[PDB]
Every structure is written in C-alpha cells, then in structure tokens.
Amino acid sequence: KLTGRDPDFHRRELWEAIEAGDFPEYELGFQLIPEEDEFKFDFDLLDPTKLIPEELVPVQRVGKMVLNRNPDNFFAENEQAAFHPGHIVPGLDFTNDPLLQGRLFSYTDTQISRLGGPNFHEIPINRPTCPYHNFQRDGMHRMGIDTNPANYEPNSINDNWPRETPPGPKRGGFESYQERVEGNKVRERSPSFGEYYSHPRLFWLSQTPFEQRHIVDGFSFELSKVVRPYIRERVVDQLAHIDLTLAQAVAKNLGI
Amino acid sequence: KLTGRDPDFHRRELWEAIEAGDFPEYELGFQLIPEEDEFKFDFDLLDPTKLIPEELVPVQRVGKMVLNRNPDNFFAENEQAAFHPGHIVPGLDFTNDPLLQGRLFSYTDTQISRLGGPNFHEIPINRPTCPYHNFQRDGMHRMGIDTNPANYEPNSINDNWPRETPPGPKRGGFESYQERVEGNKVRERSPSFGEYYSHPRLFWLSQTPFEQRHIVDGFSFELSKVVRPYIRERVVDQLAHIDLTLAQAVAKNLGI
Amino acid sequence: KLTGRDPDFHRRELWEAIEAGDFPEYELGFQLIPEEDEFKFDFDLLDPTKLIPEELVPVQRVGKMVLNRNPDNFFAENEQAAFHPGHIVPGLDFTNDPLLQGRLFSYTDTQISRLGGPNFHEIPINRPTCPYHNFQRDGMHRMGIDTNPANYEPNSINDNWPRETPPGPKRGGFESYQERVEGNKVRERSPSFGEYYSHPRLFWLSQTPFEQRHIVDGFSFELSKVVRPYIRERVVDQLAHIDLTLAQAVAKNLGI
Amino acid sequence: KLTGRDPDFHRRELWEAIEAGDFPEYELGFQLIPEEDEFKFDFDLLDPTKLIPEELVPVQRVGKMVLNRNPDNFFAENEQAAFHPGHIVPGLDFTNDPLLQGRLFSYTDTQISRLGGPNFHEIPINRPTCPYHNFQRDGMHRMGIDTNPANYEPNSINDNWPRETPPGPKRGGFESYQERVEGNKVRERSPSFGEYYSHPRLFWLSQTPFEQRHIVDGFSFELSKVVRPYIRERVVDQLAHIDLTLAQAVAKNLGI
Amino acid sequence: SENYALTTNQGVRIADDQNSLRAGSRGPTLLEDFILREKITHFDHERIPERIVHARGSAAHGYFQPYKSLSDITKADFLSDPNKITPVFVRFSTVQGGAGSADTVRDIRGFATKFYTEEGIFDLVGNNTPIFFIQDAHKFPDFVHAVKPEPHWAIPQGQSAHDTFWDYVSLQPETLHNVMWAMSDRGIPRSYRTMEGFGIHTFRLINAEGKATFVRFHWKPLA
Amino acid sequence: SENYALTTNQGVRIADDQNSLRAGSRGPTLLEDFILREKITHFDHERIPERIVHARGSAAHGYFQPYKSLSDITKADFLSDPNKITPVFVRFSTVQGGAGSADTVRDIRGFATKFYTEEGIFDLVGNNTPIFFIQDAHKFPDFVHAVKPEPHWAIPQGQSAHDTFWDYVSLQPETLHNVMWAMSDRGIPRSYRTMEGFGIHTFRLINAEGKATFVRFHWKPLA
Amino acid sequence: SENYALTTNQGVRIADDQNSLRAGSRGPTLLEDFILREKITHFDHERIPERIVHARGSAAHGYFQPYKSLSDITKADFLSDPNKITPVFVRFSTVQGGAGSADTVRDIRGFATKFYTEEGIFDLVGNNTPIFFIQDAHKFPDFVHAVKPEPHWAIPQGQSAHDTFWDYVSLQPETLHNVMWAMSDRGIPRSYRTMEGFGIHTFRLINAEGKATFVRFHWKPLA
Amino acid sequence: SENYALTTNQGVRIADDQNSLRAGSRGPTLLEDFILREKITHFDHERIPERIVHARGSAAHGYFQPYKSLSDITKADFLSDPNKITPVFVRFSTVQGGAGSADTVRDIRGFATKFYTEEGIFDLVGNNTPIFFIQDAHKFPDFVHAVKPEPHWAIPQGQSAHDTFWDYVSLQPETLHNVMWAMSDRGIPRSYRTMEGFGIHTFRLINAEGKATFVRFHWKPLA
Ligand code: HDD
Ligand code: HDD
Numbered sequence A, B, C, D: 001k002l003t004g005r006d007p008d009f010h011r012r013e014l015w016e017a018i019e020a021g022d023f024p025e026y027e028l029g030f031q032l033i034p035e036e037d038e039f040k041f042d043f044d045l046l047d048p049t050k051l052i053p054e055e056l057v058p059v060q061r062v063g064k065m066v067l068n069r070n071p072d073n074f075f076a077e078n079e080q081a082a083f084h085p086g087h088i089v090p091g092l093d094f095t096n097d098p099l100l101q102g103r104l105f106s107y108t109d110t111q112i113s114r115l116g117g118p119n120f121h122e123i124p125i126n127r128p129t130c131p132y133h134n135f136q137r138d139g140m141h142r143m144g145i146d147t148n149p150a151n152y153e154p155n156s157i158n159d160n161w162p163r164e165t166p167p168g169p170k171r172g173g174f175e176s177y178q179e180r181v182e183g184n185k186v187r188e189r190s191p192s193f194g195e196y197y198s199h200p201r202l203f204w205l206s207q208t209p210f211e212q213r214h215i216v217d218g219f220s221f222e223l224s225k226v227v228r229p230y231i232r233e234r235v236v237d238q239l240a241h242i243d244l245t246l247a248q249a250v251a252k253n254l255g256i
Numbered sequence E, F, G, H: 001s002e003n004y005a006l007t008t009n010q011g012v013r014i015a016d017d018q019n020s021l022r023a024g025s026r027g028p029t030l031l032e033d034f035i036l037r038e039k040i041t042h043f044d045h046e047r048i049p050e051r052i053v054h055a056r057g058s059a060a061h062g063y064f065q066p067y068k069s070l071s072d073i074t075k076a077d078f079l080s081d082p083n084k085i086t087p088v089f090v091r092f093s094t095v096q097g098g099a100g101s102a103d104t105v106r107d108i109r110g111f112a113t114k115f116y117t118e119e120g121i122f123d124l125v126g127n128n129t130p131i132f133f134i135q136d137a138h139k140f141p142d143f144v145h146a147v148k149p150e151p152h153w154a155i156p157q158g159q160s161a162h163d164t165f166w167d168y169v170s171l172q173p174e175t176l177h178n179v180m181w182a183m184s185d186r187g188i189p190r191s192y193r194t195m196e197g198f199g200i201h202t203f204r205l206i207n208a209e210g211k212a213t214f215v216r217f218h219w220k221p222l223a
C-alpha cells in the first residue's frame, strides 16, 4: 500500500500537476437513447446496477473540461463545497431511477447541519455566478441584505417582482417533462430490476487473463479478512452464480 | 384588547383551570365518507379551503380527551415538544390533499435546526412510550447506547433483528393504501379547486345579524390599518363577489 | 398600557421619525475621575449599583451621535447584529468592576450558538470597516478566503505577516494598562460594596412629590400582583430601610 | 509504516486485549513538592516545557487503574466523550502554569459546537454518577425536567434549595486555595521560562547510543521532507545549541 | 421538596455562589474560575430557535379513550377498545406572533395533540377553523411571509392588519374562506377550554381488510 | 426597483411558483420537486435563537463625531479629531421579554452602540439607568431567571410583577437602587428618541503617555 | 505579499501575540483578556461535520466548453454554443473513509463537478464506475452502514475488508456488479487525472420543443 | 439477543424496509413516504464535528482505587480510602490527524481519564510525554495550525514532516524539548497498553487543613 508511504498521494499529484501546468483534461460524452427505445434492452434503463453497453449505445464526445487552478484555501473552498444532483437546469431533467429519486432528497437536507443552515449557497464556492432572486429570507448566517418591499408573491407593492418566467428555448423557467405516470402507491421493487448476475458476468468475461487474476486476488484478500467463516462461503456461493472459474479460484485461496 | 391588561390570559386560564380541577374536556369526532362518494360533492374533498358541511356529513362522536396535568417545566416540555402530521400509525393514512402533502415534508425538516439534530425523538416529551428499534445510528446528542452487533439489514450477525413486520389486523407493519395514481408529472392546480366564493358566502349567510356586524367590524378595523388605499378597495372588491351587503357595510366604513 | 393599543409603538416611532427627517440626536458625555481620586468617595467606584453623582463629577459634553438611516432588512441587520462591551479599542481599557468583568466572557460565548459559530464578524452588520487580518481559520460559514501561505506565527514563509504592532500614540497595538494587582485568590464580595440604601434614598429624595406618588404606585401595582403574601411584606420591609413615607404609603395600598 | 499494513493497529490491539482478558493496568503516581520548595530548582515549576527530574523528586506510587470493558457503541461513548482539565474536585486545585490557565477556558467552550450545546453533561458517558443540582435551565437538548419551584438563588419559595455547602474535610464545597497574587497587568513571558536547551540536552545525554541514532533518524527523515532548504539549516542550527554530535549527525544526512 | 447540595453540572459542590473568583476582593476576575464560566456558559446558551409559525403556545398533559371499538372502520390500535387509555400532550397556539407575543390577538389558533399509542406516536396537528388559507403547500412561505411582521421594520406583532397580508389576500381569493372565519369571533376566542378543533385535511382510515374510508378530524369542547 | 427573474438559490429560473409537482393535477407530490423543497427548507430554517436578554429591539444606522480632540485624555482614534466621522449602528431594547414581546412595558431599556472606528469596532453597550441590579456577574443568571417568565408556566411576559422577581429583590438588597429607577417613570419611557443612556461601569481612558483616567459613559438626548 | 497589521476579528491591532494577560509574569490569566479568548474561541470552533460519505476529497477549479451546439437535443444553456465558457469546480473523493483517511485505498471514487452556468448551477455528481451497489435509495443507509467502520469499535478505516460489508453483499446480490468493479483495478486507480467518470443514472435531455431524450453521463480522461 | 420489531423512531412498525413508496413500481418516489425521509434524514445528520486536536482516539471503561488513604496531603474523596472504587473511562489519542487518520504515526499521544468520583467528575487530561511544546496557551492555535495539514492543500495527514511545523519549531526554541521526545521512540509507541502518561502541569493537592502541595501526575503501565 502507498497508504503507508504516502496517504495523500492522489491529493498531492493533482495539486502538483496543476502547479506544474499539466492540466488534467476530461471529455464529457453522452450515451443517448430516444424515448421510444425505452424497453428495447435486456435490462431496465432505470436500474442503477446495470450499465448501458457501449457497443449497443456508443458514448458521443460532447465537450472538454480542464482543471487549471488549485483552490486558495482548502477548508473554505473544498471542504465547504456542496454538490447535489438535484441541482439541474432547464434542458435537463430526471427519471424515475429509484436510486436517484432518493438522492434528490438527501443532498439538500444534509447541508443544513454540515454547512450550518439554509444559507449555504451564500458561501462563495457555492454561490451561483448568474443572478438569483426570490422571496426566501433569514436563516442562519444570512449575508444577502434584501431591499425588496415584498417577501411574498403574488404581491402588488413591488409589482410582483421578482416575477416567474414561462418556459422557452433560451432563458426560460423550469418546467418538468410531463412524463405519464400510471400505477398504485406501492413499496415494491420493479421486477425488471430482478437480474443480478449477467452484468457482473459480462464484466468478468471481458477482462484480460491477468486482470482476472487481480480480481480473484481482490476477493481473496478481502474475504480473508472476514472473521465469520460462513460469510466467506456465502459470498463465494454468489460468486458461483457469476462464473465458475472465478468462484473456484477464490474458493481455493480460502480453502473450500 | 386584553392584549394590554393580560398578554398571558389564555396561557394563564388554561393552567389555572387544571390546577383547580376543572379539567378541559374534548370530544374527538370523525366526519366519514365512503371511498365511492369521493366525487358526489359541490366541491373537491382534497381542497383544504373547503369544509365538509355537517348537514351533508354529520360529525360522529368517537372519543373523549381530558387534559388533567400542567407540565413540570415549560421549556423542557412545551417549547421542546415536536408535533408533526406525518406522524401517523397503521390504520390512518393520507390523501393527495396538496396542502397536507407538503406539510408532510416540513414538520420533519424543521426539527433539525430547532431541536438541534435528528435525535429529537430522544427528548422526553417526544419519546414514544412503546418500543422503538431500528438501524439508525449516531447524530448530535445521541442518548440511546445501541448494543446490536448490526447497524444494517438484511444482516445475518444478529439474526436480522430487529426484523420487519408484515401488515396485520393489529400489531402490524405500516403499509400504504394502494391508491391508484394516474396522470402526468405537472405543476398545476386541479380545476376542481377553482371556486373561491361560495363557502365564504355559505359562512356569512349562516351568521346571526349581530355576528355579521362583528365580521364587518373585523374587516373594517383591519383594512383601516392598511396604508396603501388601493389594497383596501381590491379587498372590498373581493368581498363583493361574496355578498353585497357585507361589501357595502365595510366599504362605507372605509369610504368608497 | 399602550401594550394593548400598539405593542410596537417605540419601534414604529423610531422608524417613522427617521423616515420623516427628524433624526434622533445624542450627546456622548464623560464623567472623568483622575486615577488618584479613586478612594475619595462615599462609595466604591467599581460598584455598578452605585452612581457617580453629577454634582460631584459633572458630565462633560464630548460628542454628538445622529441616527439617520433605518436598516434595509430587520433580521439581516438588527436581529443579527452583535454587541459586546469587550469590544474596545486602544485608548480604552477596563476596570475590575466585577459585573463588567463577567460581562466580558458572556458576549463572546453567546455568539457561537445565536449566530452559528465563530465567523459572526463576517456577517455584514458586524464586520469592521477597517482592515482585519490574523491567523484564525475555518469555522462554520467561513466567508473569508485566505491566501496567506501561513496560518501561524512566528512564520518565515510569509515573512511573519501579518505582523504585530507595538503600542503607540496612534495606529498602535493594544496594550493593557499595567494596573497593580495585590490580593489572595478569593470568591468574596468587597466590603466597599456593602451599603445598599443611601443611593436609593438619595434617588427618592430628589423626586418631585408627584414623581414620588408614581414610584409608590409602581411598587404598589407590582407587589399587588405578587401571590405569596410574605414576599410582599419583606419587600416593604426593605423599602422601610430606604425612607419611611415611601414604605408606609405602599404598605397602605397593600394593607399592612 | 504499520500505517499501510493496519491504520487501526493500536485501536484494535487495545480492544482485543480487553476481549481476551489481559486488561491494561496503570499505576497513578504523584511527584510531590512542598509549597516552600517552589523556587529551589534549576527551572520554574510552572513551565510546562520542563520536566521535574525523578532523581530530585521521585514518583510516588499511589493507585492502580484497570481497563476492563470496551464501550458498547463507539460513537455514543467514545466520540461524544468530553474530557476537560478544568474538571477537578475539592482536594485538587490549579496553579498559574500559563499553558494550563488557557486550557481551562477551551475544553468548555469547544463542547458547545462539538456536542451541540451546554447540556453535553446529560449525555450518558459524560453524566456524573453522583448527585448534581443547580439553578441552570433549558439549553438545546435539555433532558432534565426540573420541578424545583425556583430557578434562582437566593430564593425563599423553595427554602433556598439546593443550598451551597461550606468547604470541609469531606463532602465539602469547593473553595480555591488563597494563593497570594502580586504584580501588574501584563502580557509578558516570565523570564524564568527563558532557558530552552538544557532540558533537551539532559534528555539526549541519557539515551543509549542506539536510542540516540533513532532520534538522529527522526530528525533526518522529517527535515528531509521539508521543501524550503533554509528551514532545514535553522533547525539543525538550533540542534547545535543542544549538542554538537546530534547537530552534525543530522547535518550530514541532509548535506551541510 | 427534597434537599440537595448546589453543584456544577459535574456534581461538584459549590461553596460560594455569590462571587466570581478574583485576585483580591477588588481585583480582576480569574479565568480559572470554572464555576463561573460553567454557570454563564449555560446561561449564555439557554435559547433555541422558536417555531417558524405557532411560536406562541401553552400545553398540558392528559389522556384519551374511545367510546367503542372503531375496529370496523380503522385498524388503528388507539381507537380499538374503550378500555385502552392513550396518554396525550396537547399544545394550543397562535399563528403569527413569536414565543413572547400576546395570547389575545385576532388570529387562527392551533390545536395540536400528541397521542402516545402503543403502536406509535400519532400527532394530530390542527387549527380552530375547519379550513386553511391556501390550497398548495408551495405557497406556504408566501402566505406566512405576508401575514408575518413585514421584512423592513418587523411590524406588526400578532396582527393580520397590515398591507402585505391584505395585498396577498386580494390577489389570492382562495384565502377568502379562512379570512372570513378569522374576521369572525372564532378569530378571537375567549379561551382554549372553549375552542373547537379541526384536522382540516381529508385523511384516510384503513381497516384490517384494507377498506379505505375518508375522514375529517373534529374536536368539540364539552365545557 | 430593478426587475429580475424569480429563481432558486441556485439561480434556476422558476416557471410556476404556485404549485408543487405532482402526478396529475389531483395526484400526490413527487419527491423530485426540488424547487419546492428548497423553498420549504429555507422557510423551515428561518429562525435563529433570540438574545438571552434584550431579545426585543429596534435599531438604526447613523454617525458620530467628537466636539474636539480628546487626545489629552485618551489615544482612542474615534475621538481624536472632530472632522473624523465614525459610522454607527444603534440598538435600543427592553430586557425581560422575547422578540415578539411589547415595547411599552415597565422594564429597563438597552441602549447599545456599535462604533465602526478606523482602529476597530468599539461597542458601548449600556442601559437607560446609571446603575445595574447586581454587583457580581456570577449572579446574573440568578437575577435574570428571577425576572424572566417563571419556569413552570412561562408567565409573565415583559413584567417584573410576579413572585420570583420580588422574592429575589427582597433577599438581595443590592438591587434596590436599580429597582428604584425601574418603578420611577424612567422605567416606562415614551420613546427611544427621548431616552438617556449609561455605560454604568467605570472604564478607563488611556492616553498616549499611558496615563489612566477613570470614566463613565453617558448619552443625553438633544430631542 | 501585502503587508497588514495583525488584528482581532474586530480590527483591533494586536501588540503582543505571544502572551496571555496575567497578574504579574508568574500570575494567573485574567478573564479580561479579550484577545486571547477570541483567538482561542475561533480555534475552538474550527471544525465542522465531515460529509457522511466521500468525506475524503481533493478539488480544483477549471472550465468547460462544448464541441458544438447541442441545441437539437437539449435546451440547456451551457451546451448551446462552443464559444460559451462555463467555469467549473471539481471534487474527487473516496467513499468510505473520513476526511483524514488515506487516498490510496480500495474503494469507489467520487467525481463531482459543479457547473456555474448562466442559467443556474448544474451539479453532475458521479463515481468512477458506471454503476452503483444498490437499486433503491432506501437501502443507502443500510449499505453505507455496512461498508463503514463497524459500530462497536470503529474499524476499519477505508476498507470494505470486514464482515458487515460482505455480510451485506452476500445477502444483497444486487451489489455484485459494482463489487465486481471494486475488486478490479478500477478500485485502486493511480491518479485522479487518469480516472473515468460516470453519472450512473439515466437522466433526461429536453430540447426547445419538449422532446425528451434519455442520457447517461460519461467523463473520459485525455491524459 | 432480544428480538424486537424494526420501527420508525416514533415507534411505528415497518412493513417493508427495502423500498421507497412510489407511483407504480416503476414510478416517481412520493413525498409522503415519511418512513424513507425519516431513515434518510437521520443518515443525513449522522456526523458531528471531530475534536480540534486529538481527533483520533480509542477508549475503554475501567476502574481505579488508591493504595492507601492520601487524606494527609489531599482532601479529595476518590483518593481517601483503598476500599473506595472509582469508575473510569479512558481515551487514548494521537494529536494532529483526524478521526479517520492512522494510529501508527510519529506524534505525541494523549491519555485522558475521566474519574467518576462521588464528589464530582475529575478529568485528568495528559499526554505520553512529560512536557509540552509551548509555554503560553495563547500560542496554542499557532502551533497546532503549524503542525496540522497546511492550509492551501490539506497535506500532510498525521505528520509533523512539512515546512510549517519546522518553521515554527525553528523560530520557537521553547518547542525543542518536546520535539526531542517526539523524534525519540516515545513518538512511535507500539501500543497504548505499554504507554506512559503525564499531566504535564504542576497542579495542587489541598488537604483538609488547606495545606497546598505541588503535584505532577504520572501514569505508569504495569504491562
Ligand atoms: C409547508 C409548510 C407548512 C404547512 C402547509 C403547514 N404547516 Fe403547520 N407548521 C409548519 C408548517 C407548515 C412548521 C413550520 O413546520 C411548524 C412550525 C414549527 C414546527 O415545528 O412546525 C408548524 C406548525 C404548526 C403548529 C404548531 C404545533 C404546536 O402547537 O406545536 C400547528 C398547531 C400547525 N402547524 C397547524 C397547521 C395547520 C392546521 C395547517 C394546514 C394549513 C398547517 N399547519 C400547515
Ligand atoms: C440518498 C442517499 C444517497 C444515495 C442513494 C446516494 N448518495 Fe451520494 N451522497 C449522499 C447520499 C446519497 C450524501 C449523504 O447526501 C452525500 C454525503 C455528504 C454530502 O454532502 O452528500 C453524498 C455524496 C456524494 C458525493 C460527494 C460529492 C462531493 O462533495 O465531492 C459523490 C461523488 C456521490 N455522493 C456520488 C453518488 C453516486 C455516484 C450515487 C449513486 C448513483 C450516490 N452518490 C448516491
């Protein structure tokens, strides 16, 4: 482990990289699937434990991102940053992926104690760089001093400003895609989510013999550190519903 | 105003009553309506600006409640108590009333800053008197010292306890009523909620001549304290759509 | 009581006067006593239940203060403002007045809960208008982003900046006055503080007969609302050590 | 580094020892010095960068401590534990050690944000096992429901209970030792603290040649990771005022 | 009623609770007076945030029992047998004004009750009129802001008698129903002992067969 | 005065701020309506703890200037030149009652000034009577608890007229002087504009030479 | 690089930042040392809760621009023109361990990007494998508690190698797919500069006509 | 070991703890799923601020008893009789690193002991070396900031081996004594079980007659 030699290695390399000038670069690409192709696959699109295979739907190059400046103060900018996937913009929208749906609730909620309340967007690193105005007020560590005669809408005392903005091609207000919804109020996993082994298989199958050795060693090392023996066997057991070689190799290393 | 002679009147009266022995009594009563009568009314059942009139659905005596004991410590017990409508039990359930729906998010959120974290249930006045167990851990001011070998589930290291419970006639798990949901994702007010004046006029029409004078006086006293004159007139204008006499009585008092 | 008619009267009067252009005006005046007169008085200068009589030490006119602008938002500016008497500057200093001494601890410590942490000076209303720099970092809602390579001192990596500044006539560092201290470590009230009745008496004795009626009425009205009768008599009893007329008058109205 | 093999070694070794039965034991000993020997030493007793040598004042065996029980929940009992040196009992008292004095302020103040408010003592692992009672009230997460008619003192409504208690031989109240204090109000380091090298030297001089090599390695590995070269030479430089061999050994490893 | 020593929260008997520790009776207070700081610290931190709304309240403990098993319409334990007693805690409140505003104001009242059933806590959070001001929760912050003391000067306390309330009312006719109630005499009740209660929302009752019944909650005062 | 779009705190323009997102205009609210929860969340965390005392206040911005340089008795910059204008912010308050309590109560008043000097913030935090109720800070919580609403029922708001207060006064004679002033007419002043203010404590002025002069702070209203 | 005076947070110049105020050089420390307590206070409240997950992270500012207008598939401004530069802040992280845990551990990696667009903040919060461990948000706390240090002794740091994790994996086959990637060499990458990024979920792109297109987000390193 | 039903914290038995409530098994998660939000909320607010220093610790319960009454030198109950058994809780710690840093680093260690005496809690808070780094508590934040990860990039965790630490050491010779010990083998002990302890400061023991005795606390391991 470099966890002994240097526990900050990755943090350090990224920084020093940027100091030096070799700016990490990344390409954002989209995998795109039209609405009607929703159910033309072996598996459920909204199943976050299944990947869309690239040979079926290719990743289209879409832009370049470049990291070119380290922060000035770690705590102020890094520790205090708040990222949250609910934070989308017109042109984007969600789906019913039930892992994401829940996420949407948590990244907001968790800011309230971590950043000490509902004004966390006033901390510089989180502050939008575009305009923002609304009728929210107060809250702990409030920085914005509001001059608006009104803190509600509709209002006539400030001619109703800030006003809502109807949805449009550019500079529009946010409206949700009007997805049809049909069903009963239920706590129940979609049966389409019911298949756990073929993706894990497809993955293994496309690993080089020496990558596969590594995976075996991973399972082996980790399972070796489990104290209760039966857990060990039960895992391998699952390993078995995936690919026999893998299951055995590992099982051999733990002795079964 | 007794707001000048005694600002604590009600607080005071209520306590002194219980001291003395005349316990305030209350009869809980249910208005009941079978599922299938949902759309048999002049108005929408889920519109919280509308009352179910007693002469259509009578109020059924169902229970008696008695307040017999002042708290020992106002702050510890009153200030720190946390009431929330999302706090229900098997046998009760919600409906799609869009006021209530949102209510359901807020009474939980707000406790986190008001009572300093997610262990507010551990404070005495909020602590349930039945058993409560789960795999939740930690959080500011934790009082309960968990001995479970497992903080997750499913878990085999404590035989999966505490275990879930299937829904049942009594002592059952909570499961929601499988209400059928149909429609598109939209931010739109149901047209069935779109009538504002007839319940107000039904209310006015059933007040004694001297109760009606009081209502005019309320409106007149309040609107007289509004600085911007056009607001006065717009209100009175809305009063008109309710009943012409009311509108004019009030109008006269403010000079229109 | 206007507590009934207008519970906001004073708040309203102050605002409306500023609106109008009659800006409240105040003269700051000092009572000055040379260090060597410290003990030439009937009473102890450090006793905060004693006033310095104007006829002994006159109040010298020193400056004028004018209030000419209402805030823009009440919460952001008023509710969040933080006042603390430990906030002095070079040219001022404290004394061993044991009420002020304790005071010095409290106005700091209470900010941490009320305003959410140690960065409260960073809220606009409390922020100095002169420069401020030091080596403090972090804490909740931190706004200041620090670029200084160092967060400590002495430091060589930023040439020891920001540097300390020696005391001087102007723009100097804060040095405490080198007051001589000589005593044992004791929780003990100074005997020079032991006299409780002649300042009250001096006060009463200088009130017009009709102000004097008013004081009686105050004492009478308040004691009248006291439940436990003996508390009534002990107070009146203490009144008695102040002036006999006063004690009696009030005794009369409560019946003793 | 065992920082790579097992980052949790010590935590694990302690827990696993207590599991097995070999409870860690410790002997509490006191170095005692009579009040009048206060100035009899090469150094100032109140300077915490100086040790009292055992050959002048021997460590007197005084008690046995045994650790026999790992906690139930790490967070609830470990994380939230609040230790503070100002937490002493009658029979003990502080001295004017200036490190200690400041400590006294901090461990109290830091709980308020760390543990969520002034009722951290009500948390199990911090709660006294003896009776505790005062007139404090409220605060976030107050668990104690106070019945006492009075929240102040002196009070007559509860016969002034709870009552203070005079200092005694046993079950006495707390009274500070009446140390004489004499001097001016000053921010100044006692000149008796101003000798920095002879304690370091005495320490090095009493290390076995292979213990000494280890210290040279410590200095040499650490100083080597210092980027700024002149810092390296100033340390080594300081090292020379301690012992020439040490200075040189280290200097050699770093090239000076 | 039971005589104990006055202590620090660490259970350390206090000798003198009338002075700070100082260097001489007329000297500076010493930072090592850990009893002082403890006392002041807790005093310093006594307050918590008050309710956003319904900050002003009085409550009391009590109990509840049903006249007869409702087992037919709802599988709710606390209603399933007239011999089962459920403890309750009940909080009455105003809406607009703070923890320290007047009780005796024109304003909706809240009527909230905590039922400690044997199958969980059931909170029934209601007001003293049968309807609310608004239809969608999304507008709550708007309406509350409009009835609350106005943002520039913080006036008034415990009053709907200012521009923003009535501005909002005039542009939001939905409100007119509850406004009516508010302007009536139910808006200025003379005591909590004689106040009606309403749960306002239509909720459901689910019986052991999973039959659903719509319900609305009413409290009627027997005094 | 300057027209902007309504947005979230993340700067995302809002199209409809009158409804939540639901499944069908008669359906249940979806958790994914992030515009809702931000709005409600902010509203849900609006309040912060009030001041332990002087919770009730009113404040305004202003300025100050001295009549002549006081460099002879103090080196304090804000007093060193009549041409040097110091901005100020001033809060007047009551003592006992909470944020939403009344103004027109019988109580001491606070008179707190924040001087934004070129050499630091100086806060002169006084009351409207020249002395205080108690001699040692260690007693503060006792007396404040005494005057504050009583613990059991939280009565009364903004009044010294109850038992605990007079219990405490009667057994702590030191308070009699300030109690005197409170019962006078200074305890029910008619406006902040016509109020006196006092620093109460004896402080020190220090001049350029290190000479200490005892001082007491006064505010006199010119209205 | 700019030479300022050392001050308190109130802007008051400090003269000796080396000593507490005491009575005599060998004396006790005085409560009136306001400079000390400000310094110590701020130090005392330096810390804030770490993230629940991904506590351990490294970030950097950057920028993004698209290759061509995507206007055809999405009306999102930041993607509407290759000349539009959008600032970004990016944070890479591990999942299990704390703020002070090691970088180089076997674990999933976070790869979060805050896009400051002209039409709002868009946060794209992904990991370095194309799928998650679990299917419904409701198990998050269970899976996380299982992977985390165990509750009795808080071991281990930054390792799935203990019972609870494989206990859970074993009983929740859904997790196998990601577990596969975790045991791969993707689970122990050698630098953030050479890492892949996935948003995992299927999201929607919405164009100016209301046409929805399903999407999945990828970050591909050009280093 | 005691089979209970899994509930919400309001004690409501949970039926299904594997899903969210949605509209159709393939539909949007509903806001009314109060059981979800309760589970998540809690998870969301699990972490609290770690200690400013000594973040990283291990603890255990135990007990203590004296060898013989020390009544002669001190009137402290827990030391007054060999038959009085005092409960204790003890935490050992590193200094610099966080909650999730490594145990096996070169650093001072802490050794703090809470004594639940019958006369109050006594806290003995020491390290594993007999002296400390600095003389005045005012310098604490400077030192700690110097030793701690550096402000720009947060490196290194659990190491004095960077510039600031030694920059501070090189300009504050008072530090050399502890630094010595730090670079010794006392700086990398192999277990808490074999570690020494010191109270560092000279405290006082006060006996029944008020006779002061200077003391310094040691803990010696019998392993
Ligand atoms: C979406 C926000 C929201 C909505 C629509 C409502 N409430 Fe509410 N309510 C809150 C938000 C809130 C709150 C901000 O969460 C409070 C304040 C403090 C607290 O803990 O909950 C609260 C409190 C609160 C209290 C105080 C309970 C107590 O006495 O302790 C009562 C009596 C009510 N409400 C009654 C109602 C009624 C009858 C509503 C139907 C219109 C209603 N609330 C809607
Ligand atoms: C609702 C529970 C929940 C679920 C199902 C997920 N998360 Fe999460 N995630 C959280 C809850 C959470 C959190 C508790 O809300 C965190 C921890 C601290 C924070 O601010 O957000 C967080 C943080 C967090 C961070 C740290 C961002 C940063 O501050 O640098 C990343 C990269 C991810 N998550 C990635 C994911 C991915 C790729 C998920 C599956 C697709 C996922 N999370 C699911």
Ligand code: HDD
Residues within 6 Å of the ligand: D081, D082, D083, D099, D102, D103, D105, D106, D107, D108, D110, D111, D114, G040, G044, H050, H051, H052, H053, H054, H057, H091, H092, H093, H109, H110, H111, H112, H125, H126, H127, H131, H132, H133, H137, H140, H200
């Ligand atoms: C205010 C300045 C200050 C000073 C001068 C010291 N400390 Fe400290 N110490 C703190 C401030 C602090 C603190 C920040 O207040 C901590 C951090 C978190 C906490 O609860 O207390 C703490 C904690 C803390 C803990 C951990 C509690 C535990 O183990 O769970 C130990 C062992 C020490 N300290 C040991 C010392 C020693 C041996 C010092 C003298 C050499 C010392 N501290 C000085």
